[PDB]
Amino acid sequence: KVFGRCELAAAMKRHGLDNYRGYSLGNWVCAAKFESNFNTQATNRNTDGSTDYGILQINSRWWCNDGRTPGSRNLCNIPCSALLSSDITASVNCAKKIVSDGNGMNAWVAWRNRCKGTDVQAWIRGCRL
Ligand SMILES: [Cl-]
């Protein structure tokens, strides 16, 4: 599924991401935009042979099992294919574990390079939330 900006903001707000560990909704929408272009079906292969999955590009090296990342952890205890669903529940619940692991949203390279220190509330402007 390819989300609209406000559609995704509303879905993330309903799943409890607005101000989760102090990150306003704008931060999550901005990260999703640059990670996946709001496409739940986004996959990208890393140099290490790991693969990034879904709207928040969650990595198979640490977070999910794709059956092809040797020696990897499955710290969200899900198949990576669960992260490609039109329902963002699995992506959001895993993201909550990631952002809680000590480095906050710095875990998302596109958030650090394209969202951090910007006016992120611009991403939820005009939305009915
Ligand atoms: Cl933090």
Side-chain angles (χ1 to χ4, degrees), residues 2-22:
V2 179
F3 278 80
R5 179 177 62 86
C6 291
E7 188 184 4
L8 179 66
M12 290 177 153
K13 175 167 210 301
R14 185 172 75 91
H15 285 98
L17 281 182
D18 189 12
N19 271 315
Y20 190 81
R21 294 196 44 115

Side-chain angles (χ1 to χ4, degrees), residues 21 23 99 102-106:
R21 294 196 44 115
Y23 290 96
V99 74
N103 307 133
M105 288 202 66
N106 294 296

